[PDB]
Motif scaffolding. Structure first.
Motif, PDB file in Angstrom:
ATOM      1  N   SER A  96      -9.353  -8.486  -6.224  1.00 16.81           N
ATOM      2  CA  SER A  96      -8.104  -9.209  -6.021  1.00 16.81           C
ATOM      3  C   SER A  96      -7.562  -9.017  -4.613  1.00 16.81           C
ATOM      4  N   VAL A  97      -7.478 -10.116  -3.859  1.00 16.08           N
ATOM      5  CA  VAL A  97      -6.759 -10.108  -2.588  1.00 16.08           C
ATOM      6  C   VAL A  97      -5.406 -10.783  -2.774  1.00 16.08           C
ATOM      7  N   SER A  98      -5.281 -11.567  -3.843  1.00 13.14           N
ATOM      8  CA  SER A  98      -4.025 -12.250  -4.125  1.00 13.14           C
ATOM      9  C   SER A  98      -3.007 -11.340  -4.802  1.00 13.14           C
ATOM     10  N   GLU A  99      -3.425 -10.162  -5.261  1.00 10.79           N
ATOM     11  CA  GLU A  99      -2.466  -9.090  -5.477  1.00 10.79           C
ATOM     12  C   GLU A  99      -2.216  -8.347  -4.175  1.00 10.79           C
ATOM     13  N   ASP A 100      -3.208  -8.342  -3.290  1.00 12.79           N
ATOM     14  CA  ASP A 100      -3.168  -7.422  -2.169  1.00 12.79           C
ATOM     15  C   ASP A 100      -2.343  -7.985  -1.023  1.00 12.79           C
ATOM     16  N   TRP A 101      -2.045  -9.285  -1.042  1.00 14.58           N
ATOM     17  CA  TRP A 101      -0.968  -9.762  -0.188  1.00 14.58           C
ATOM     18  C   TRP A 101       0.378  -9.504  -0.819  1.00 14.58           C
ATOM     19  N   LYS A 102       0.436  -9.532  -2.149  1.00 17.58           N
ATOM     20  CA  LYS A 102       1.715  -9.434  -2.840  1.00 17.58           C
ATOM     21  C   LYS A 102       2.236  -8.010  -2.873  1.00 17.58           C
ATOM     22  N   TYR A 103       1.389  -7.031  -2.574  1.00 15.22           N
ATOM     23  CA  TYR A 103       1.888  -5.676  -2.455  1.00 15.22           C
ATOM     24  C   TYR A 103       2.315  -5.387  -1.027  1.00 15.22           C
ATOM     25  N   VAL A 104       1.914  -6.233  -0.079  1.00 11.40           N
ATOM     26  CA  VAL A 104       2.444  -6.105   1.274  1.00 11.40           C
ATOM     27  C   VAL A 104       3.866  -6.624   1.309  1.00 11.40           C
ATOM     28  N   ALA A 105       4.129  -7.682   0.556  1.00  9.11           N
ATOM     29  CA  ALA A 105       5.445  -8.300   0.611  1.00  9.11           C
ATOM     30  C   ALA A 105       6.450  -7.583  -0.273  1.00  9.11           C
ATOM     31  N   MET A 106       5.988  -6.667  -1.109  1.00  4.17           N
ATOM     32  CA  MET A 106       6.923  -5.789  -1.784  1.00  4.17           C
ATOM     33  C   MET A 106       7.393  -4.697  -0.840  1.00  4.17           C
ATOM     34  N   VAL A 107       6.554  -4.304   0.113  1.00  5.12           N
ATOM     35  CA  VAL A 107       6.830  -3.058   0.815  1.00  5.12           C
ATOM     36  C   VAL A 107       7.518  -3.332   2.149  1.00  5.12           C
ATOM     37  N   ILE A 108       7.527  -4.590   2.597  1.00  8.63           N
ATOM     38  CA  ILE A 108       8.183  -4.863   3.873  1.00  8.63           C
ATOM     39  C   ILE A 108       9.686  -5.025   3.669  1.00  8.63           C
ATOM     40  N   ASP A 109      10.107  -5.674   2.581  1.00  8.97           N
ATOM     41  CA  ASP A 109      11.539  -5.873   2.398  1.00  8.97           C
ATOM     42  C   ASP A 109      12.178  -4.649   1.774  1.00  8.97           C
ATOM     43  N   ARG A 110      11.375  -3.793   1.147  1.00 13.94           N
ATOM     44  CA  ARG A 110      11.918  -2.549   0.624  1.00 13.94           C
ATOM     45  C   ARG A 110      12.067  -1.512   1.722  1.00 13.94           C
ATOM     46  N   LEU A 111      11.396  -1.723   2.850  1.00  9.97           N
ATOM     47  CA  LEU A 111      11.756  -1.018   4.067  1.00  9.97           C
ATOM     48  C   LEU A 111      13.092  -1.516   4.587  1.00  9.97           C
ATOM     49  N   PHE A 112      13.376  -2.802   4.393  1.00 10.95           N
ATOM     50  CA  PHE A 112      14.612  -3.359   4.919  1.00 10.95           C
ATOM     51  C   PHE A 112      15.807  -3.055   4.036  1.00 10.95           C
ATOM     52  N   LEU A 113      15.583  -2.570   2.818  1.00  8.36           N
ATOM     53  CA  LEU A 113      16.705  -2.197   1.971  1.00  8.36           C
ATOM     54  C   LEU A 113      17.304  -0.878   2.420  1.00  8.36           C
ATOM     55  N   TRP A 114      16.501  -0.008   3.034  1.00 10.25           N
ATOM     56  CA  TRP A 114      17.057   1.248   3.514  1.00 10.25           C
ATOM     57  C   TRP A 114      17.797   1.056   4.823  1.00 10.25           C
ATOM     58  N   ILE A 115      17.357   0.102   5.642  1.00  8.43           N
ATOM     59  CA  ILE A 115      17.975   0.004   6.954  1.00  8.43           C
ATOM     60  C   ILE A 115      19.062  -1.051   6.982  1.00  8.43           C
ATOM     61  N   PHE A 116      19.464  -1.578   5.823  1.00  7.24           N
ATOM     62  CA  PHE A 116      20.760  -2.242   5.760  1.00  7.24           C
ATOM     63  C   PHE A 116      21.788  -1.409   5.023  1.00  7.24           C
ATOM     64  N   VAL A 117      21.352  -0.498   4.154  1.00  7.68           N
ATOM     65  CA  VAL A 117      22.306   0.374   3.474  1.00  7.68           C
ATOM     66  C   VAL A 117      22.781   1.467   4.430  1.00  7.68           C
ATOM     67  N   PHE A 118      21.955   1.819   5.417  1.00  8.52           N
ATOM     68  CA  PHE A 118      22.385   2.780   6.430  1.00  8.52           C
ATOM     69  C   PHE A 118      23.320   2.154   7.464  1.00  8.52           C
ATOM     70  N   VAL A 119      23.373   0.820   7.528  1.00  9.29           N
ATOM     71  CA  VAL A 119      24.344   0.146   8.386  1.00  9.29           C
ATOM     72  C   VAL A 119      25.624  -0.159   7.604  1.00  9.29           C
ATOM     73  N   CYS A 120      25.495  -0.418   6.296  1.00 10.79           N
ATOM     74  CA  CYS A 120      26.642  -0.786   5.462  1.00 10.79           C
ATOM     75  C   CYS A 120      27.530   0.420   5.160  1.00 10.79           C
ATOM     76  N   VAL A 121      26.950   1.617   5.115  1.00  8.02           N
ATOM     77  CA  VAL A 121      27.786   2.810   5.034  1.00  8.02           C
ATOM     78  C   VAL A 121      28.351   3.141   6.416  1.00  8.02           C
ATOM     79  N   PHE A 122      27.636   2.757   7.484  1.00 11.21           N
ATOM     80  CA  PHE A 122      28.128   2.965   8.851  1.00 11.21           C
ATOM     81  C   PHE A 122      29.269   1.999   9.189  1.00 11.21           C
TER      82      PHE A 122
END
Lengths: 49, 93
Positions: B61-87
């Motif tokens: 499966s490569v069609s899962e293997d793109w879909k696990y990249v797109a889970m992990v890029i925006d979940r990186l972005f969830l930490w770096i907007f919560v660190f601005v929203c508390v700031f």
């Protein structure tokens, strides 16, 4: 069709068509062993179909 | 216009952060809908995006293997907007 496996019937119906294309040359070379030109041109318009 | 009220500065900064979110959401949605007949998947992408996520404390499966990249890029972005929203509330104090 890549990650569908080469033994799948996706690949087999592709491979089912490709024994006919030798055999339509073997329909064309069958009449060509006499060298009759219009019967060698009888299967020459067949291969595009 | 000799002075700007404090609600307008906070509303204009959260409007700027929401338009940064729509640009990174369009990039995440294009990376999710890829496919092996159209796209390439370089090793750099494999060894930096299926190796990063224990710095996120994210674990497996490569069609899962793109879909696990797109889970992990925006979940990186969830930490770096919560660190601005508390700031942005300790920019008030």
């Amino acid at each position: 069709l890549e990650d569908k496996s080469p033994d799948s019937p996706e690949m087999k119906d592709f491979r089912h068509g490709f024994d006919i294309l030798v055999g339509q040359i073997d329909d064309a070379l069958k009449l060509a062993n006499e060298g009759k030109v219009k019967e060698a041109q009888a299967a020459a318009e067949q291969l595009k179909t | 216009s000799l002075d700007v009220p404090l609600v307008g500065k906070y509303l204009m900064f959260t409007m700027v952060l929401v338009t940064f979110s729509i640009v990174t959401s369009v990039c995440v949605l294009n990376v999710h809908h890829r496919s092996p007949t159209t796209h390439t998947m370089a090793p750099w992408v494999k060894v930096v995006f299926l190796e990063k996520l224990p710095a996120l404390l994210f674990m497996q499966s490569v069609s899962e293997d793109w879909k696990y990249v797109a889970m992990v890029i925006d979940r990186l972005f969830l930490w770096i907007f919560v660190f601005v929203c508390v700031f942005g509330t300790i920019g008030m104090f």
